[PDB]
Amino acid sequence: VHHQKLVFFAEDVGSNKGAIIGLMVGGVV
Amino acid sequence: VHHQKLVFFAEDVGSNKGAIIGLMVGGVV
Amino acid sequence: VHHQKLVFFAEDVGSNKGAIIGLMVGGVV
Amino acid sequence: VHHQKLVFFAEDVGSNKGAIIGLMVGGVV
Amino acid sequence: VHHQKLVFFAEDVGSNKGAIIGLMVGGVV
Amino acid sequence: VHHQKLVFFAEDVGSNKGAIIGLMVGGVV
Amino acid sequence: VHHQKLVFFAEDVGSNKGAIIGLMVGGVV
Amino acid sequence: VHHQKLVFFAEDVGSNKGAIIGLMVGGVV
Incomplete structure (x- = not known):
C-alpha cells in the first residue's frame, strides 16, 4: 500500500522577539 | 491549547527530468 | 511496455496570506 | 477534509512533427 | 501498407478555477 | 453514460488545392 | 498501366463540442 | 525548586530527507 504524507x-508568533523557527516545508514518501 | 493545522x-518526482510545481510551504492564524 | 501516468x-490555501508553493506540472509519455 | 485531485x-507523439499543446496543470476541490 | 496512427x-476540466494546459494537436508518420 | 469515441x-497537406480537413484536436472520452 | 493508389x-462526426478539426476528404482528376 | 510552565x-521528520522548517522557540528580557 502507498506511503502518503500527513x-x-x-507556528508561534507574539510580541516581536526572536527564536529558532522558520517554515516552508517540502518532503514525500 | 493552540489549534493545529492538518x-x-x-510532490511529483520520478526518473529525473523537472517541472513547474513547487513546494516549501508555511502560514498561521 | 507502456506506463500510464497517474x-x-x-494544493494548500485558506485566508489570504503566503507560502512558497506552485502548481503546474510536467512529465510526458 | 475534502477530496484529493487525481x-x-x-501526450501524443510518434514520428518527429509539430503541434499545439501545453501541460503544467494545477487546481484543488 | 503503413501502420495506423491512433x-x-x-483534457482536465471541473469546478471553476484555472490551470496551464493546452491541447489541439497534430502528426503524421 | 455517454458513448466512447475511437x-x-x-494529416493531408501538399501542393495547394483543397479538401475539407483541419487537425489540431482537443477532447475527453 | 501505372500502379494504383489506396x-x-x-472522418470527423461527433457529439457537438469543439477543438480544431475536420476530416471529410476528396480530390479531382 | 522553581516551578515551570510547559x-x-x-517538528516534521520521520525517515531522512529535508525541508526548511523549525519551531523550537524562546525569548529573553
Whole structure:
C-alpha cells in the first residue's frame, strides 16, 4: 500500500522577539 | 491549547527530468 | 511496455496570506 | 477534509512533427 | 501498407478555477 | 453514460488545392 | 498501366463540442 | 525548586530527507 504524507503544524508568533523557527516545508514518501 | 493545522502533500518526482510545481510551504492564524 | 501516468495533488490555501508553493506540472509519455 | 485531485495525462507523439499543446496543470476541490 | 496512427486524449476540466494546459494537436508518420 | 469515441489521424497537406480537413484536436472520452 | 493508389482515413462526426478539426476528404482528376 | 510552565511543539521528520522548517522557540528580557 502507498506511503502518503500527513503533517500537523502550529507556528508561534507574539510580541516581536526572536527564536529558532522558520517554515516552508517540502518532503514525500 | 493552540489549534493545529492538518495538511497532506504529495510532490511529483520520478526518473529525473523537472517541472513547474513547487513546494516549501508555511502560514498561521 | 507502456506506463500510464497517474498523479495525486492537493494544493494548500485558506485566508489570504503566503507560502512558497506552485502548481503546474510536467512529465510526458 | 475534502477530496484529493487525481490527474491522468497522455501526450501524443510518434514520428518527429509539430503541434499545439501545453501541460503544467494545477487546481484543488 | 503503413501502420495506423491512433490518437488517445483526455483534457482536465471541473469546478471553476484555472490551470496551464493546452491541447489541439497534430502528426503524421 | 455517454458513448466512447475511437478515432485515428494522419494529416493531408501538399501542393495547394483543397479538401475539407483541419487537425489540431482537443477532447475527453 | 501505372500502379494504383489506396488511402485509409477516419472522418470527423461527433457529439457537438469543439477543438480544431475536420476530416471529410476528396480530390479531382 | 522553581516551578515551570510547559509547551508542546511538532517538528516534521520521520525517515531522512529535508525541508526548511523549525519551531523550537524562546525569548529573553
